[PDB]
């Protein structure tokens, strides 16, 4: 149900494999291969921990294990999807597509979140606690923006782009440092003066965010999907299918493992868990082999 | 250590602003 965030996150993750027409990360094919391997090691550990703590009934350790497995599965899928894309575009008939310098939706979410938080801490009807929590929100999304700018500069070879992205990021970080400072003063002594000062301090941050927005909007910095040929599509299918099956069986493993955690004495569920684990292993092996066989440059 | 959340935020952003400053020029 809506409760099972791990299962829902596996489903969300599967979307990466549905049509790899754009690069999802900055990994080379070598990077993808390394990632797959590392995440294999980590996933094995996790799956062992899941069984063990389901038997022993160690619910907190079990939960940590599910969280670990989930992370590894995310990492696997990102690597597999990226690898798929790289295999596709590498086909002679395929024309490559530009990686987006920033995620525009995630950017807009940061903008709106920062905005709401500033507006909150600006209010008269706002407790000391609420100002702090508002600040953690501002901080969360602000750092997200700066990090995205850092990546954007690394990605782009454009001279004005690299400079301005890093510059805008610096403005955001600076003015956020100024905001968090006056909020710390306000936390030291909660008074009208300090609250009005805080309402001022948001102006340069909002301006900085707005500037960065205008700059990032430029269609030169946006992503363009790849023209992937039927041959390229055929080449990447085994990787995609292996990755999908891996996710199916992993979801099955988690789902069954919860039931076993609440009721360990059930041989059928244990047999189902085993089957899921084995299909996961076989999917990972078939994925690795598929990535080797279809490795670009051949 | 048990540090103040605001202290941690300020530290993070000063550090990041320095890093960005240095990254280009």
PDB file of C-alpha atoms in Angstrom:
ATOM      1  CA  UNK A   1       0.000   0.000   0.000  1.00  0.00           C
ATOM      2  CA  UNK A   2       0.847   3.747   0.116  1.00  0.00           C
ATOM      3  CA  UNK A   3       2.815   2.873   3.288  1.00  0.00           C
ATOM      4  CA  UNK A   4       5.506   0.807   1.495  1.00  0.00           C
ATOM      5  CA  UNK A   5       7.922   3.553   0.419  1.00  0.00           C
ATOM      6  CA  UNK A   6      10.590   1.005  -0.645  1.00  0.00           C
ATOM      7  CA  UNK A   7       8.279  -0.777  -3.115  1.00  0.00           C
ATOM      8  CA  UNK A   8       6.920   2.583  -4.439  1.00  0.00           C
ATOM      9  CA  UNK A   9      10.531   3.834  -4.826  1.00  0.00           C
ATOM     10  CA  UNK A  10      11.444   0.734  -6.854  1.00  0.00           C
ATOM     11  CA  UNK A  11       8.495   1.542  -9.150  1.00  0.00           C
ATOM     12  CA  UNK A  12       9.653   5.181  -9.430  1.00  0.00           C
ATOM     13  CA  UNK A  13      13.202   3.939 -10.155  1.00  0.00           C
ATOM     14  CA  UNK A  14      11.930   1.634 -13.002  1.00  0.00           C
ATOM     15  CA  UNK A  15      10.965   4.835 -14.916  1.00  0.00           C
ATOM     16  CA  UNK A  16      14.699   5.382 -15.603  1.00  0.00           C
ATOM     17  CA  UNK A  17      14.634   2.223 -17.780  1.00  0.00           C
ATOM     18  CA  UNK A  18      11.434   3.047 -19.723  1.00  0.00           C
ATOM     19  CA  UNK A  19      13.073   5.193 -22.436  1.00  0.00           C
ATOM     20  CA  UNK A  20      16.777   6.144 -21.934  1.00  0.00           C
ATOM     21  CA  UNK A  21      16.896   8.971 -24.543  1.00  0.00           C
ATOM     22  CA  UNK A  22      18.871  11.348 -22.272  1.00  0.00           C
ATOM     23  CA  UNK A  23      21.860  10.816 -19.908  1.00  0.00           C
ATOM     24  CA  UNK A  24      20.647  10.621 -16.272  1.00  0.00           C
ATOM     25  CA  UNK A  25      24.097  11.132 -14.691  1.00  0.00           C
ATOM     26  CA  UNK A  26      27.718  12.027 -15.565  1.00  0.00           C
ATOM     27  CA  UNK A  27      29.154   8.467 -15.610  1.00  0.00           C
ATOM     28  CA  UNK A  28      31.235   6.997 -18.428  1.00  0.00           C
ATOM     29  CA  UNK A  29      30.501   3.363 -19.470  1.00  0.00           C
ATOM     30  CA  UNK A  30      33.476   2.423 -17.233  1.00  0.00           C
ATOM     31  CA  UNK A  31      31.771   4.319 -14.393  1.00  0.00           C
ATOM     32  CA  UNK A  32      28.507   2.427 -14.986  1.00  0.00           C
ATOM     33  CA  UNK A  33      30.341  -0.923 -14.920  1.00  0.00           C
ATOM     34  CA  UNK A  34      32.126  -0.023 -11.656  1.00  0.00           C
ATOM     35  CA  UNK A  35      28.804   1.156 -10.131  1.00  0.00           C
ATOM     36  CA  UNK A  36      27.001  -2.081 -11.053  1.00  0.00           C
ATOM     37  CA  UNK A  37      29.798  -4.118  -9.437  1.00  0.00           C
ATOM     38  CA  UNK A  38      29.937  -2.078  -6.195  1.00  0.00           C
ATOM     39  CA  UNK A  39      26.143  -2.055  -5.878  1.00  0.00           C
ATOM     40  CA  UNK A  40      26.218  -5.860  -6.395  1.00  0.00           C
ATOM     41  CA  UNK A  41      28.482  -6.251  -3.347  1.00  0.00           C
ATOM     42  CA  UNK A  42      26.317  -3.858  -1.303  1.00  0.00           C
ATOM     43  CA  UNK A  43      23.040  -5.500  -2.432  1.00  0.00           C
ATOM     44  CA  UNK A  44      24.293  -8.970  -1.454  1.00  0.00           C
ATOM     45  CA  UNK A  45      25.143  -7.689   2.040  1.00  0.00           C
ATOM     46  CA  UNK A  46      21.684  -6.094   2.285  1.00  0.00           C
ATOM     47  CA  UNK A  47      19.828  -9.249   1.162  1.00  0.00           C
ATOM     48  CA  UNK A  48      21.776 -11.335   3.700  1.00  0.00           C
ATOM     49  CA  UNK A  49      20.855  -8.810   6.423  1.00  0.00           C
ATOM     50  CA  UNK A  50      17.186  -8.921   5.374  1.00  0.00           C
ATOM     51  CA  UNK A  51      16.953 -12.726   5.777  1.00  0.00           C
ATOM     52  CA  UNK A  52      19.025 -12.851   8.993  1.00  0.00           C
ATOM     53  CA  UNK A  53      17.064 -10.126  10.815  1.00  0.00           C
ATOM     54  CA  UNK A  54      13.734 -11.548   9.586  1.00  0.00           C
ATOM     55  CA  UNK A  55      14.677 -14.892  11.196  1.00  0.00           C
ATOM     56  CA  UNK A  56      16.064 -13.300  14.377  1.00  0.00           C
ATOM     57  CA  UNK A  57      13.298 -10.666  14.439  1.00  0.00           C
ATOM     58  CA  UNK A  58      15.633  -7.658  14.686  1.00  0.00           C
ATOM     59  CA  UNK A  59      13.217  -5.050  13.327  1.00  0.00           C
ATOM     60  CA  UNK A  60      15.499  -1.935  13.435  1.00  0.00           C
ATOM     61  CA  UNK A  61      18.476  -3.754  11.797  1.00  0.00           C
ATOM     62  CA  UNK A  62      16.024  -5.274   9.278  1.00  0.00           C
ATOM     63  CA  UNK A  63      14.743  -1.779   8.388  1.00  0.00           C
ATOM     64  CA  UNK A  64      18.309  -0.524   7.929  1.00  0.00           C
ATOM     65  CA  UNK A  65      18.867  -3.545   5.647  1.00  0.00           C
ATOM     66  CA  UNK A  66      15.821  -2.740   3.472  1.00  0.00           C
ATOM     67  CA  UNK A  67      17.044   0.883   3.253  1.00  0.00           C
ATOM     68  CA  UNK A  68      20.506  -0.345   2.164  1.00  0.00           C
ATOM     69  CA  UNK A  69      19.048  -2.708  -0.449  1.00  0.00           C
ATOM     70  CA  UNK A  70      16.886   0.151  -1.787  1.00  0.00           C
ATOM     71  CA  UNK A  71      19.917   2.453  -2.137  1.00  0.00           C
ATOM     72  CA  UNK A  72      21.845  -0.281  -3.984  1.00  0.00           C
ATOM     73  CA  UNK A  73      18.866  -0.913  -6.287  1.00  0.00           C
ATOM     74  CA  UNK A  74      18.643   2.814  -7.076  1.00  0.00           C
ATOM     75  CA  UNK A  75      22.385   2.835  -7.866  1.00  0.00           C
ATOM     76  CA  UNK A  76      22.056  -0.286 -10.030  1.00  0.00           C
ATOM     77  CA  UNK A  77      19.195   1.173 -12.056  1.00  0.00           C
ATOM     78  CA  UNK A  78      20.882   4.550 -12.598  1.00  0.00           C
ATOM     79  CA  UNK A  79      24.017   2.741 -13.822  1.00  0.00           C
ATOM     80  CA  UNK A  80      22.004   0.392 -16.069  1.00  0.00           C
ATOM     81  CA  UNK A  81      19.902   3.219 -17.571  1.00  0.00           C
ATOM     82  CA  UNK A  82      22.974   5.400 -18.222  1.00  0.00           C
ATOM     83  CA  UNK A  83      24.751   2.390 -19.777  1.00  0.00           C
ATOM     84  CA  UNK A  84      21.678   1.764 -21.948  1.00  0.00           C
ATOM     85  CA  UNK A  85      21.728   5.415 -23.199  1.00  0.00           C
ATOM     86  CA  UNK A  86      25.484   5.194 -23.945  1.00  0.00           C
ATOM     87  CA  UNK A  87      24.950   1.956 -25.908  1.00  0.00           C
ATOM     88  CA  UNK A  88      22.112   3.592 -27.890  1.00  0.00           C
ATOM     89  CA  UNK A  89      23.728   6.891 -28.925  1.00  0.00           C
ATOM     90  CA  UNK A  90      26.964   5.039 -29.822  1.00  0.00           C
ATOM     91  CA  UNK A  91      25.172   3.457 -32.817  1.00  0.00           C
ATOM     92  CA  UNK A  92      26.336   5.102 -36.110  1.00  0.00           C
ATOM     93  CA  UNK A  93      22.700   5.899 -37.087  1.00  0.00           C
ATOM     94  CA  UNK A  94      21.985   7.453 -33.657  1.00  0.00           C
ATOM     95  CA  UNK A  95      22.466  11.212 -33.140  1.00  0.00           C
ATOM     96  CA  UNK A  96      23.445  12.252 -29.592  1.00  0.00           C
ATOM     97  CA  UNK A  97      21.334  14.485 -27.336  1.00  0.00           C
ATOM     98  CA  UNK A  98      22.437  17.258 -24.957  1.00  0.00           C
ATOM     99  CA  UNK A  99      22.430  16.648 -21.197  1.00  0.00           C
ATOM    100  CA  UNK A 100      20.407  19.249 -19.287  1.00  0.00           C
ATOM    101  CA  UNK A 101      22.692  21.466 -17.186  1.00  0.00           C
ATOM    102  CA  UNK A 102      20.003  21.565 -14.470  1.00  0.00           C
ATOM    103  CA  UNK A 103      16.718  19.794 -13.677  1.00  0.00           C
ATOM    104  CA  UNK A 104      14.185  22.619 -14.326  1.00  0.00           C
ATOM    105  CA  UNK A 105      11.324  21.090 -12.263  1.00  0.00           C
ATOM    106  CA  UNK A 106      13.632  20.425  -9.282  1.00  0.00           C
ATOM    107  CA  UNK A 107      14.903  23.997  -9.795  1.00  0.00           C
ATOM    108  CA  UNK A 108      11.324  25.368  -9.703  1.00  0.00           C
ATOM    109  CA  UNK A 109      10.603  23.308  -6.513  1.00  0.00           C
ATOM    110  CA  UNK A 110      13.719  24.858  -4.892  1.00  0.00           C
ATOM    111  CA  UNK A 111      12.583  28.350  -5.963  1.00  0.00           C
ATOM    112  CA  UNK A 112       9.037  27.909  -4.591  1.00  0.00           C
ATOM    113  CA  UNK A 113      10.215  26.212  -1.363  1.00  0.00           C
ATOM    114  CA  UNK A 114      12.784  28.938  -0.583  1.00  0.00           C
ATOM    115  CA  UNK A 115      10.095  31.543  -1.360  1.00  0.00           C
ATOM    116  CA  UNK A 116       7.495  30.017   1.001  1.00  0.00           C
ATOM    117  CA  UNK A 117      10.116  29.727   3.779  1.00  0.00           C
ATOM    118  CA  UNK A 118      11.164  33.398   3.418  1.00  0.00           C
ATOM    119  CA  UNK A 119       7.492  34.447   3.471  1.00  0.00           C
ATOM    120  CA  UNK A 120       6.990  32.345   6.640  1.00  0.00           C
ATOM    121  CA  UNK A 121       9.903  33.827   8.630  1.00  0.00           C
ATOM    122  CA  UNK A 122       8.739  37.268   7.446  1.00  0.00           C
ATOM    123  CA  UNK A 123       5.380  36.882   9.257  1.00  0.00           C
ATOM    124  CA  UNK A 124       4.481  38.440  12.655  1.00  0.00           C
ATOM    125  CA  UNK A 125       2.497  35.261  13.483  1.00  0.00           C
ATOM    126  CA  UNK A 126       5.559  32.990  13.431  1.00  0.00           C
ATOM    127  CA  UNK A 127       7.160  31.327  16.486  1.00  0.00           C
ATOM    128  CA  UNK A 128      10.890  31.065  17.236  1.00  0.00           C
ATOM    129  CA  UNK A 129      10.663  27.331  16.413  1.00  0.00           C
ATOM    130  CA  UNK A 130       8.883  28.038  13.098  1.00  0.00           C
ATOM    131  CA  UNK A 131      11.648  30.460  12.042  1.00  0.00           C
ATOM    132  CA  UNK A 132      14.289  27.733  12.623  1.00  0.00           C
ATOM    133  CA  UNK A 133      12.328  25.082  10.696  1.00  0.00           C
ATOM    134  CA  UNK A 134      11.740  27.623   7.890  1.00  0.00           C
ATOM    135  CA  UNK A 135      15.525  28.209   7.846  1.00  0.00           C
ATOM    136  CA  UNK A 136      16.231  24.459   7.484  1.00  0.00           C
ATOM    137  CA  UNK A 137      13.894  24.478   4.451  1.00  0.00           C
ATOM    138  CA  UNK A 138      15.614  27.544   2.930  1.00  0.00           C
ATOM    139  CA  UNK A 139      18.956  25.823   3.619  1.00  0.00           C
ATOM    140  CA  UNK A 140      17.873  22.479   2.102  1.00  0.00           C
ATOM    141  CA  UNK A 141      16.840  23.920  -1.277  1.00  0.00           C
ATOM    142  CA  UNK A 142      19.531  26.643  -1.395  1.00  0.00           C
ATOM    143  CA  UNK A 143      22.305  24.017  -1.125  1.00  0.00           C
ATOM    144  CA  UNK A 144      20.459  21.951  -3.766  1.00  0.00           C
ATOM    145  CA  UNK A 145      20.649  24.949  -6.142  1.00  0.00           C
ATOM    146  CA  UNK A 146      24.371  25.602  -5.481  1.00  0.00           C
ATOM    147  CA  UNK A 147      25.198  21.906  -5.960  1.00  0.00           C
ATOM    148  CA  UNK A 148      23.227  21.866  -9.236  1.00  0.00           C
ATOM    149  CA  UNK A 149      25.150  24.964 -10.412  1.00  0.00           C
ATOM    150  CA  UNK A 150      28.456  23.181  -9.520  1.00  0.00           C
ATOM    151  CA  UNK A 151      27.387  20.206 -11.704  1.00  0.00           C
ATOM    152  CA  UNK A 152      26.120  22.521 -14.480  1.00  0.00           C
ATOM    153  CA  UNK A 153      29.524  24.267 -14.732  1.00  0.00           C
ATOM    154  CA  UNK A 154      31.359  20.905 -14.800  1.00  0.00           C
ATOM    155  CA  UNK A 155      29.026  19.625 -17.599  1.00  0.00           C
ATOM    156  CA  UNK A 156      29.089  22.745 -19.828  1.00  0.00           C
ATOM    157  CA  UNK A 157      32.162  23.663 -21.901  1.00  0.00           C
ATOM    158  CA  UNK A 158      30.657  27.140 -22.487  1.00  0.00           C
ATOM    159  CA  UNK A 159      32.833  29.998 -21.082  1.00  0.00           C
ATOM    160  CA  UNK A 160      30.026  32.391 -20.026  1.00  0.00           C
ATOM    161  CA  UNK A 161      27.975  29.443 -18.720  1.00  0.00           C
ATOM    162  CA  UNK A 162      30.652  28.001 -16.406  1.00  0.00           C
ATOM    163  CA  UNK A 163      31.449  31.482 -14.950  1.00  0.00           C
ATOM    164  CA  UNK A 164      27.831  32.648 -14.464  1.00  0.00           C
ATOM    165  CA  UNK A 165      26.576  29.340 -13.002  1.00  0.00           C
ATOM    166  CA  UNK A 166      29.362  29.350 -10.374  1.00  0.00           C
ATOM    167  CA  UNK A 167      28.791  33.101  -9.834  1.00  0.00           C
ATOM    168  CA  UNK A 168      25.023  32.752  -9.304  1.00  0.00           C
ATOM    169  CA  UNK A 169      25.695  29.817  -6.949  1.00  0.00           C
ATOM    170  CA  UNK A 170      28.067  32.038  -4.943  1.00  0.00           C
ATOM    171  CA  UNK A 171      25.404  34.778  -4.692  1.00  0.00           C
ATOM    172  CA  UNK A 172      22.854  32.234  -3.427  1.00  0.00           C
ATOM    173  CA  UNK A 173      25.283  30.795  -0.821  1.00  0.00           C
ATOM    174  CA  UNK A 174      26.445  34.272   0.295  1.00  0.00           C
ATOM    175  CA  UNK A 175      22.964  35.749   0.780  1.00  0.00           C
ATOM    176  CA  UNK A 176      21.779  32.520   2.446  1.00  0.00           C
ATOM    177  CA  UNK A 177      24.718  32.767   4.879  1.00  0.00           C
ATOM    178  CA  UNK A 178      23.562  36.359   5.575  1.00  0.00           C
ATOM    179  CA  UNK A 179      19.964  35.183   6.130  1.00  0.00           C
ATOM    180  CA  UNK A 180      20.864  32.253   8.425  1.00  0.00           C
ATOM    181  CA  UNK A 181      23.109  34.678  10.370  1.00  0.00           C
ATOM    182  CA  UNK A 182      20.377  37.260  11.137  1.00  0.00           C
ATOM    183  CA  UNK A 183      18.034  34.338  11.967  1.00  0.00           C
ATOM    184  CA  UNK A 184      20.684  33.130  14.463  1.00  0.00           C
ATOM    185  CA  UNK A 185      20.715  36.653  15.952  1.00  0.00           C
ATOM    186  CA  UNK A 186      16.889  36.447  16.089  1.00  0.00           C
ATOM    187  CA  UNK A 187      17.262  33.063  17.852  1.00  0.00           C
ATOM    188  CA  UNK A 188      19.596  34.825  20.304  1.00  0.00           C
ATOM    189  CA  UNK A 189      17.006  37.559  20.971  1.00  0.00           C
ATOM    190  CA  UNK A 190      13.503  37.258  19.449  1.00  0.00           C
ATOM    191  CA  UNK A 191      12.492  40.898  18.806  1.00  0.00           C
ATOM    192  CA  UNK A 192      10.750  43.045  16.154  1.00  0.00           C
ATOM    193  CA  UNK A 193      14.064  44.586  14.999  1.00  0.00           C
ATOM    194  CA  UNK A 194      15.619  41.152  14.351  1.00  0.00           C
ATOM    195  CA  UNK A 195      12.438  39.921  12.534  1.00  0.00           C
ATOM    196  CA  UNK A 196      12.311  43.001  10.235  1.00  0.00           C
ATOM    197  CA  UNK A 197      16.053  42.554   9.577  1.00  0.00           C
ATOM    198  CA  UNK A 198      15.345  38.918   8.612  1.00  0.00           C
ATOM    199  CA  UNK A 199      12.541  40.080   6.223  1.00  0.00           C
ATOM    200  CA  UNK A 200      15.139  42.391   4.595  1.00  0.00           C
ATOM    201  CA  UNK A 201      17.764  39.604   4.397  1.00  0.00           C
ATOM    202  CA  UNK A 202      15.455  37.491   2.165  1.00  0.00           C
ATOM    203  CA  UNK A 203      15.400  40.143  -0.610  1.00  0.00           C
ATOM    204  CA  UNK A 204      18.983  39.571  -1.942  1.00  0.00           C
ATOM    205  CA  UNK A 205      18.493  35.762  -1.737  1.00  0.00           C
ATOM    206  CA  UNK A 206      15.224  35.881  -3.705  1.00  0.00           C
ATOM    207  CA  UNK A 207      16.864  38.221  -6.246  1.00  0.00           C
ATOM    208  CA  UNK A 208      19.845  35.832  -6.573  1.00  0.00           C
ATOM    209  CA  UNK A 209      17.518  32.833  -7.052  1.00  0.00           C
ATOM    210  CA  UNK A 210      15.475  34.828  -9.606  1.00  0.00           C
ATOM    211  CA  UNK A 211      18.651  35.744 -11.548  1.00  0.00           C
ATOM    212  CA  UNK A 212      19.849  32.119 -11.634  1.00  0.00           C
ATOM    213  CA  UNK A 213      16.344  31.129 -12.799  1.00  0.00           C
ATOM    214  CA  UNK A 214      16.448  33.602 -15.711  1.00  0.00           C
ATOM    215  CA  UNK A 215      19.931  32.365 -16.677  1.00  0.00           C
ATOM    216  CA  UNK A 216      19.060  28.642 -16.451  1.00  0.00           C
ATOM    217  CA  UNK A 217      15.847  29.195 -18.482  1.00  0.00           C
ATOM    218  CA  UNK A 218      18.014  29.831 -21.579  1.00  0.00           C
ATOM    219  CA  UNK A 219      17.161  27.034 -24.090  1.00  0.00           C
ATOM    220  CA  UNK A 220      20.897  26.471 -24.767  1.00  0.00           C
ATOM    221  CA  UNK A 221      21.226  24.994 -21.233  1.00  0.00           C
ATOM    222  CA  UNK A 222      18.166  22.698 -21.500  1.00  0.00           C
ATOM    223  CA  UNK A 223      18.276  18.980 -22.366  1.00  0.00           C
ATOM    224  CA  UNK A 224      17.645  17.671 -25.893  1.00  0.00           C
ATOM    225  CA  UNK A 225      16.601  13.986 -26.328  1.00  0.00           C
ATOM    226  CA  UNK A 226      18.790  11.699 -28.480  1.00  0.00           C
ATOM    227  CA  UNK A 227      17.796  10.375 -31.902  1.00  0.00           C
ATOM    228  CA  UNK A 228      18.217   6.673 -31.047  1.00  0.00           C
ATOM    229  CA  UNK A 229      18.135   4.292 -34.036  1.00  0.00           C
ATOM    230  CA  UNK A 230      16.185   0.973 -34.108  1.00  0.00           C
ATOM    231  CA  UNK A 231      19.616  -0.761 -34.094  1.00  0.00           C
ATOM    232  CA  UNK A 232      20.668   1.193 -30.991  1.00  0.00           C
ATOM    233  CA  UNK A 233      17.326   0.293 -29.297  1.00  0.00           C
ATOM    234  CA  UNK A 234      17.936  -3.409 -30.102  1.00  0.00           C
ATOM    235  CA  UNK A 235      21.482  -3.137 -28.692  1.00  0.00           C
ATOM    236  CA  UNK A 236      20.319  -1.749 -25.309  1.00  0.00           C
ATOM    237  CA  UNK A 237      17.286  -4.045 -24.791  1.00  0.00           C
ATOM    238  CA  UNK A 238      19.120  -6.861 -22.882  1.00  0.00           C
ATOM    239  CA  UNK A 239      20.477  -4.340 -20.312  1.00  0.00           C
ATOM    240  CA  UNK A 240      17.017  -2.773 -19.894  1.00  0.00           C
ATOM    241  CA  UNK A 241      15.229  -6.159 -19.562  1.00  0.00           C
ATOM    242  CA  UNK A 242      17.824  -7.503 -17.087  1.00  0.00           C
ATOM    243  CA  UNK A 243      17.543  -4.318 -14.993  1.00  0.00           C
ATOM    244  CA  UNK A 244      13.720  -4.466 -15.010  1.00  0.00           C
ATOM    245  CA  UNK A 245      13.653  -8.144 -13.966  1.00  0.00           C
ATOM    246  CA  UNK A 246      16.178  -7.363 -11.216  1.00  0.00           C
ATOM    247  CA  UNK A 247      13.776  -4.679  -9.891  1.00  0.00           C
ATOM    248  CA  UNK A 248      10.727  -6.998 -10.101  1.00  0.00           C
ATOM    249  CA  UNK A 249      12.431  -9.756  -8.121  1.00  0.00           C
ATOM    250  CA  UNK A 250      13.938  -7.258  -5.631  1.00  0.00           C
ATOM    251  CA  UNK A 251      10.477  -5.790  -4.938  1.00  0.00           C
ATOM    252  CA  UNK A 252       9.224  -9.350  -4.514  1.00  0.00           C
ATOM    253  CA  UNK A 253      12.084 -10.034  -2.078  1.00  0.00           C
ATOM    254  CA  UNK A 254      11.299  -6.966   0.071  1.00  0.00           C
ATOM    255  CA  UNK A 255       7.522  -7.588   0.060  1.00  0.00           C
ATOM    256  CA  UNK A 256       7.984 -11.241   1.107  1.00  0.00           C
ATOM    257  CA  UNK A 257      10.702 -10.285   3.633  1.00  0.00           C
ATOM    258  CA  UNK A 258       8.312  -7.932   5.551  1.00  0.00           C
ATOM    259  CA  UNK A 259       5.750 -10.776   5.863  1.00  0.00           C
ATOM    260  CA  UNK A 260       8.539 -13.033   7.175  1.00  0.00           C
ATOM    261  CA  UNK A 261       9.648 -10.322   9.622  1.00  0.00           C
ATOM    262  CA  UNK A 262       6.126 -10.250  11.130  1.00  0.00           C
ATOM    263  CA  UNK A 263       5.800 -14.090  10.947  1.00  0.00           C
ATOM    264  CA  UNK A 264       9.133 -16.003  10.574  1.00  0.00           C
ATOM    265  CA  UNK A 265       7.641 -19.582  10.752  1.00  0.00           C
ATOM    266  CA  UNK A 266       6.511 -20.011   7.107  1.00  0.00           C
ATOM    267  CA  UNK A 267       8.473 -22.345   4.746  1.00  0.00           C
ATOM    268  CA  UNK A 268       6.524 -21.257   1.583  1.00  0.00           C
ATOM    269  CA  UNK A 269       7.434 -17.529   2.156  1.00  0.00           C
ATOM    270  CA  UNK A 270      11.071 -18.565   2.796  1.00  0.00           C
ATOM    271  CA  UNK A 271      11.081 -20.520  -0.491  1.00  0.00           C
ATOM    272  CA  UNK A 272       9.561 -17.493  -2.281  1.00  0.00           C
ATOM    273  CA  UNK A 273      12.223 -15.213  -0.734  1.00  0.00           C
ATOM    274  CA  UNK A 274      14.965 -17.610  -1.899  1.00  0.00           C
ATOM    275  CA  UNK A 275      13.532 -17.670  -5.439  1.00  0.00           C
ATOM    276  CA  UNK A 276      13.431 -13.859  -5.540  1.00  0.00           C
ATOM    277  CA  UNK A 277      17.053 -13.615  -4.287  1.00  0.00           C
ATOM    278  CA  UNK A 278      18.198 -16.108  -6.983  1.00  0.00           C
ATOM    279  CA  UNK A 279      16.328 -14.257  -9.767  1.00  0.00           C
ATOM    280  CA  UNK A 280      17.968 -11.018  -8.519  1.00  0.00           C
ATOM    281  CA  UNK A 281      21.420 -12.671  -8.731  1.00  0.00           C
ATOM    282  CA  UNK A 282      20.696 -14.093 -12.209  1.00  0.00           C
ATOM    283  CA  UNK A 283      19.379 -10.697 -13.391  1.00  0.00           C
ATOM    284  CA  UNK A 284      22.514  -8.917 -12.112  1.00  0.00           C
ATOM    285  CA  UNK A 285      24.780 -11.500 -13.802  1.00  0.00           C
ATOM    286  CA  UNK A 286      22.804 -11.247 -17.066  1.00  0.00           C
ATOM    287  CA  UNK A 287      22.991  -7.429 -16.778  1.00  0.00           C
ATOM    288  CA  UNK A 288      26.793  -7.468 -16.319  1.00  0.00           C
ATOM    289  CA  UNK A 289      27.290  -9.934 -19.202  1.00  0.00           C
ATOM    290  CA  UNK A 290      24.876  -7.887 -21.346  1.00  0.00           C
ATOM    291  CA  UNK A 291      26.833  -4.685 -20.569  1.00  0.00           C
ATOM    292  CA  UNK A 292      30.148  -6.411 -21.517  1.00  0.00           C
ATOM    293  CA  UNK A 293      28.769  -7.877 -24.792  1.00  0.00           C
ATOM    294  CA  UNK A 294      27.166  -4.568 -25.846  1.00  0.00           C
ATOM    295  CA  UNK A 295      30.064  -2.389 -24.588  1.00  0.00           C
ATOM    296  CA  UNK A 296      30.532   0.573 -27.007  1.00  0.00           C
ATOM    297  CA  UNK A 297      33.584   1.054 -29.280  1.00  0.00           C
ATOM    298  CA  UNK A 298      33.465  -2.507 -30.682  1.00  0.00           C
TER     299      UNK A 298
ATOM    300  CA  UNK B   1      30.029  16.964  18.508  1.00  0.00           C
ATOM    301  CA  UNK B   2      26.531  18.194  19.433  1.00  0.00           C
ATOM    302  CA  UNK B   3      26.430  21.380  17.320  1.00  0.00           C
ATOM    303  CA  UNK B   4      23.652  23.914  16.668  1.00  0.00           C
ATOM    304  CA  UNK B   5      21.679  23.335  13.442  1.00  0.00           C
ATOM    305  CA  UNK B   6      22.110  27.026  12.461  1.00  0.00           C
ATOM    306  CA  UNK B   7      25.863  26.801  13.173  1.00  0.00           C
ATOM    307  CA  UNK B   8      26.028  23.767  10.840  1.00  0.00           C
ATOM    308  CA  UNK B   9      24.028  25.544   8.083  1.00  0.00           C
ATOM    309  CA  UNK B  10      26.184  28.699   8.273  1.00  0.00           C
ATOM    310  CA  UNK B  11      29.371  26.576   8.219  1.00  0.00           C
ATOM    311  CA  UNK B  12      28.097  24.611   5.190  1.00  0.00           C
ATOM    312  CA  UNK B  13      27.250  27.757   3.197  1.00  0.00           C
ATOM    313  CA  UNK B  14      30.438  29.681   4.058  1.00  0.00           C
ATOM    314  CA  UNK B  15      32.430  26.569   3.058  1.00  0.00           C
ATOM    315  CA  UNK B  16      30.410  26.184  -0.158  1.00  0.00           C
ATOM    316  CA  UNK B  17      30.748  29.900  -1.031  1.00  0.00           C
ATOM    317  CA  UNK B  18      34.534  29.568  -0.598  1.00  0.00           C
ATOM    318  CA  UNK B  19      34.639  26.404  -2.741  1.00  0.00           C
ATOM    319  CA  UNK B  20      32.579  28.085  -5.496  1.00  0.00           C
ATOM    320  CA  UNK B  21      34.698  31.260  -5.314  1.00  0.00           C
ATOM    321  CA  UNK B  22      37.844  29.164  -5.840  1.00  0.00           C
ATOM    322  CA  UNK B  23      36.367  26.808  -8.504  1.00  0.00           C
ATOM    323  CA  UNK B  24      36.511  29.554 -11.163  1.00  0.00           C
ATOM    324  CA  UNK B  25      39.069  32.269 -10.403  1.00  0.00           C
TER     325      UNK B  25
END
